[PDB]
Design an enzyme around this catalytic site. Structure first.
Site, PDB file in Angstrom:
ATOM      1  N   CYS A  86      -2.270  -3.691  -3.914  1.00 45.32           N
ATOM      2  CA  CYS A  86      -1.882  -2.879  -2.732  1.00 45.32           C
ATOM      3  C   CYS A  86      -0.868  -3.585  -1.845  1.00 45.32           C
ATOM      4  O   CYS A  86      -1.151  -4.638  -1.273  1.00 45.32           O
ATOM      5  CB  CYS A  86      -3.110  -2.509  -1.876  1.00 45.32           C
ATOM      6  SG  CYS A  86      -2.783  -1.470  -0.382  1.00 45.32           S
ATOM      7  N   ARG A  96      -1.410  -3.930   2.578  1.00 43.51           N
ATOM      8  CA  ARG A  96      -2.584  -4.597   3.130  1.00 43.51           C
ATOM      9  C   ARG A  96      -2.393  -5.297   4.468  1.00 43.51           C
ATOM     10  O   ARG A  96      -3.331  -5.884   4.985  1.00 43.51           O
ATOM     11  CB  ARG A  96      -3.119  -5.614   2.130  1.00 43.51           C
ATOM     12  CG  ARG A  96      -3.950  -5.021   1.024  1.00 43.51           C
ATOM     13  CD  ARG A  96      -4.413  -6.131   0.075  1.00 43.51           C
ATOM     14  NE  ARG A  96      -3.322  -6.611  -0.776  1.00 43.51           N
ATOM     15  CZ  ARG A  96      -3.407  -7.689  -1.554  1.00 43.51           C
ATOM     16  NH1 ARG A  96      -4.522  -8.403  -1.585  1.00 43.51           N
ATOM     17  NH2 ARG A  96      -2.376  -8.053  -2.302  1.00 43.51           N
ATOM     18  N   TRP A 109      -0.992   6.043   4.522  1.00 43.63           N
ATOM     19  CA  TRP A 109       0.234   6.826   4.484  1.00 43.63           C
ATOM     20  C   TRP A 109       1.124   6.369   3.317  1.00 43.63           C
ATOM     21  O   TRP A 109       0.940   5.286   2.774  1.00 43.63           O
ATOM     22  CB  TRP A 109       1.005   6.716   5.796  1.00 43.63           C
ATOM     23  CG  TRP A 109       1.284   5.315   6.237  1.00 43.63           C
ATOM     24  CD1 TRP A 109       2.335   4.516   5.846  1.00 43.63           C
ATOM     25  CD2 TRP A 109       0.511   4.540   7.157  1.00 43.63           C
ATOM     26  NE1 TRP A 109       2.252   3.292   6.468  1.00 43.63           N
ATOM     27  CE2 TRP A 109       1.142   3.283   7.279  1.00 43.63           C
ATOM     28  CE3 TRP A 109      -0.659   4.788   7.894  1.00 43.63           C
ATOM     29  CZ2 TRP A 109       0.643   2.277   8.110  1.00 43.63           C
ATOM     30  CZ3 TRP A 109      -1.154   3.791   8.717  1.00 43.63           C
ATOM     31  CH2 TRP A 109      -0.501   2.551   8.822  1.00 43.63           C
ATOM     32  N   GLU A 126       6.584   6.195  -3.826  1.00 42.38           N
ATOM     33  CA  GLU A 126       5.453   6.843  -4.477  1.00 42.38           C
ATOM     34  C   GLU A 126       5.786   8.297  -4.778  1.00 42.38           C
ATOM     35  O   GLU A 126       5.562   8.776  -5.888  1.00 42.38           O
ATOM     36  CB  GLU A 126       4.190   6.749  -3.612  1.00 42.38           C
ATOM     37  CG  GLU A 126       3.785   5.313  -3.263  1.00 42.38           C
ATOM     38  CD  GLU A 126       2.452   5.250  -2.512  1.00 42.38           C
ATOM     39  OE1 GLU A 126       1.421   5.547  -3.149  1.00 42.38           O
ATOM     40  OE2 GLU A 126       2.436   4.904  -1.302  1.00 42.38           O
TER      41      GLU A 126
END
Ligand code: HEM
Ligand code: HEM
Ligand SMILES: Cc1cc(N)nc2cc(-c3cccc(CCN)c3)ccc12
Ligand SMILES: Cc1cc(N)nc2cc(-c3cccc(CCN)c3)ccc12
Ligand SMILES: C[C@H](O)[C@H](O)[C@H]1CNc2nc(N)[nH]c(=O)c2N1
Ligand SMILES: C[C@H](O)[C@H](O)[C@H]1CNc2nc(N)[nH]c(=O)c2N1
Ligand SMILES: [Zn+2]
Lengths: 412, 413
Positions: B110, B113, B282, B287
């Site tokens: 991720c 973070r 969000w 993506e």
């Protein structure tokens, strides 16, 4: 443990059995993955270190010519066995030398161009004794590989290590690279990656034109002696003027690059034998120049200059002006090379080729060691097929390995 | 044992000691790296549960500076007796919140973070039915969305007991578009969602059959068969995609939802498994712009966009694909910002993460990171994470993958 790899874009699944023949270690454990470490980790082979290495190599070799278990095989095993017990080393037959080199390329898990691996031109330079001799072998390599823009794969192999006191080494990282000078006022003129070496050359006697694209001289070390400077004849160095097929102002940026990528600082290992000087060459993937050489912050770093000329909004990052500029630069690199009829491949073409090569190796060899972190291009990653391809990384021999820079070690 | 990582762009070197606290395993061995395998393989009895409990409680009370206190020893004792007596145990609220936050913190794939300490934790452990689940999820969505000003949140449903009474959200994300396989081989909508769509339809969903239909919720409580629910449309914030200079882009008819909320992963805390634990933040622009729109196996709009831009689509070395990808990503960011919906570009987010990472080396002694996933799917090397070496190892608490429930579920009928 007869592992499977999936392609998530095509659902193609391949079973890997070749990984079981792996010798060396990866640097990963069950507890930690070091797959993104750039370089994980006197040592001349002892007598008993070397027999198994030689046997391993001869076994693959004679299997590859369908002579495993033959008199010829056994005879050779015996002959090399005798020579090591006697001389504390041994010598490769020309045929074995060529097999070893081609397979070192086949086994290079970070190389995306390996579909060409069997068509490598091997130049045996083991009879070489001096830097002038080395210079001569290297000029012939460059001229052959360049071939008037129609590039050809080649490697030139200098004598093998003996006791570490008599090593052959090419001190340049590539046969052809532009100089780097740190300005007394700002940062750097030319190529920042080469600033230290550019200085060692100068500190060794080179006179520099102090331009932005000065071809570096060769620093050649034979038999562990002090190295010597040689200028590569300009008519042997093929260069490409960089222009854009749409933006006339692009030409005015005053950029060019050389056609021949030729790495000269790595170590080739065959059957336990160490070749500390073995410059090899192919042809560029476009992004190596356009994305890395030109746009890296710690290199030429021309992005802002170009975005300016395009009149993009460089006020916020979310306008993606860097991305837009990056694409145009790379469009220009490909356009320039293609126009000048110098061999080059785009990252779409090369990654597709590699998928095909993976297919072939799983089918006819049982696998193909691959380093995802290096195979995926530094731009437009996920619109290339290698992005969605699972890959297993393991170390096979023969291999190319990294070695310390000469100037940190040289018993001066 | 020390371990060093180097940033090759800045020559910064960091030292990792945190990897020593690692318990689980990577999938890699001495002789093979499996760092690019998407899901490495990498019903639980009291035998193995109290060590797992003790480890977590030791961490928890260390973080709050009460290690070895009376509150710490009594808590260990209480958990022990509860396990031998009941074969499981319950987490206090404070422990659950710590749990969910550290799971996110430990999520090595991720890039977002930096935000890990600002997670809103919703405790739905008193839930018992799918209707109750639907209600908890609606509230999650309303809170997280917040009229475009997004807020990180997670809702935690009851933990697994005997594995026969699991809570599951059958959707992979709370908000996703339908995909429909047409007879002629083509797909209408999102190709990624065709299978789940077919399940929904079987379970009695009436499909609008458009290219952007929001899927219904399929919710399983206590191991019972799952039930359909429709998210109220006023709760689903969507953004029409237009381009700042290309007026024909809006005519492509694209939109996307604002809230990314993953709902198929498993949260593991102190040996306890929470099989339903939807979490949301969000979007990073890529993506949507790169993967959702431009993957060949997704909406795959590169062609249509390349044509309208009139690009040389004949040979690939014209980089028409690369050019079209940038414009689409420009459009996604422009649209979200225009509508004041929270979004971050890949340049800002990778930069934030490098800062996070350095901070985590200093105050924590490491930061597990999966390079293969952290590096953005476009413009890789002009982001600072590309040049950053990273160590990947697994810490608990953690989020884990789990198999799709329609493969493991025993149907009641
Ligand atoms: C003919 C076309 C070739 C292409 C397009 C190509 C492409 C590449 C690229 C893109 C890389 C990544 C390095 C970087 O990004 O800077 C690479 C690495 C490498 N290449 Fe190839 N290459 C070619 C030929 C060769 C040949 C002829 C050899 C040796 C005989 C070779 C051996 C290697 C090795 C050893 C590495 C690094 C592997 C490692 O560090 O383990 N390549 N190549
Ligand atoms: C707030 C802004 C956030 C951003 C921008 C963000 C970004 C991302 C991205 C881009 C990925 C890779 C997904 C892909 O490329 O398909 C990812 C992975 C992941 N994220 Fe985040 N995320 C955010 C918040 C969160 C939150 C709130 C959680 C949980 C509480 C979370 C947990 C995870 C997990 C578990 C993964 C997969 C990790 C693994 O398998 O190790 N993220 N994130
Ligand atoms: C033969 C050949 C061709 C090519 N186009 N690129 C290479 C790139 C390399 C290479 C190997 C290790 C490290 C590097 C530079 C790091 N980006 C380059 C080696 C050989 C190459
Ligand atoms: C909370 C959150 C925000 C965000 N922008 N992306 C996420 C992406 C994920 C994620 C994790 C694993 C796999 C996937 C989809 C496969 N690429 C997404 C999970 C949570 C996310
Ligand atoms: C830290 C990271 O491993 C390093 O930047 C690597 C990443 N991937 C790469 N990939 C290629 N092809 N070439 C490189 O130089 C690098 N650099
Ligand atoms: C095979 C490969 O590991 C797979 O495609 C991964 C690569 N890296 C990724 N990285 C991110 N952020 N998201 C992904 O879905 C993937 N997919
Ligand atoms: Zn690994």
């Amino acid at each position: 443990r007869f592992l499977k790899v999936k392609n998530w874009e095509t659902d193609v699944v391949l079973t890997d059995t070749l990984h079981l023949k792996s010798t060396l270690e990866t640097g990963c454990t069950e507890h930690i993955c070091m797959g993104s470490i750039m370089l994980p980790s006197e040592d001349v082979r002892t007598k008993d270190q070397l027999f198994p290495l030689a046997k391993e190599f001869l076994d693959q070799y004679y299997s590859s010519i369908k002579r495993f278990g033959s008199k010829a095989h056994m005879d050779r095993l015996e002959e090399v066995n005798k020579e090591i017990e006697s001389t504390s080393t041994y010598q490769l037959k020309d045929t074995e030398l060529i097999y070893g080199a081609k397979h070192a390329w086949r086994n290079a898990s970070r190389c995306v161009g390996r579909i060409q691996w069997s068509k490598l031109q091997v130049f045996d330079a083991r009879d070489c004794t001096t830097a002038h001799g080395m210079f001569n072998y290297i000029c012939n390599h460059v001229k052959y590989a360049t071939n008037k823009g129609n590039l050809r794969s080649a490697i030139t192999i200098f004598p093998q290590r003996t006791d570490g006191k008599h090593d052959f080494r090419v001190w340049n990282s590539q046969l052809i690279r532009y100089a780097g000078y740190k300005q007394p006022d700002g940062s750097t003129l030319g190529d920042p990656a080469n600033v230290q070496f550019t200085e060692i050359c100068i500190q060794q006697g080179w006179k520099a034109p102090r331009g932005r694209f000065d071809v570096l001289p060769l620093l050649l070390q034979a038999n562990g002696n002090d190295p010597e400077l040689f200028q590569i004849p300009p008519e042997l160095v093929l260069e490409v003027p960089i222009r854009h097929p749409k933006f006339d102002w692009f030409k005015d940026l005053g950029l060019k690059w050389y056609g021949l990528p030729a790495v000269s600082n790595m170590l080739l290992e065959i059957g336990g034998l160490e070749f500390s000087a073995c410059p090899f060459s192919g042809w560029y993937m476009g992004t190596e120049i356009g994305v890395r050489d030109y746009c890296d912050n710690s290199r030429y770093n021309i992005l802002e200059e170009v975005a300016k000329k395009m009149d993009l909004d460089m006020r916020k990052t979310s306008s993606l002006w860097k991305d837009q500029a990056l694409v145009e630069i790379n469009i220009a690199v490909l356009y320039s090379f293609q126009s000048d009829k110098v061999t080059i491949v785009d990252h779409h073409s090369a990654t597709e080729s590699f998928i095909k090569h993976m297919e072939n190796e799983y089918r006819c060899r049982g696998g193909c060691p691959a380093d995802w972190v290096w195979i995926v291009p530094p731009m437009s990653g996920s619109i290339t097929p290698v992005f969605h391809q699972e890959m297993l990384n393991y170390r096979l021999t023969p291999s190319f390995e990294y070695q310390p820079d000469p100037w940190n070690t040289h018993v001066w």
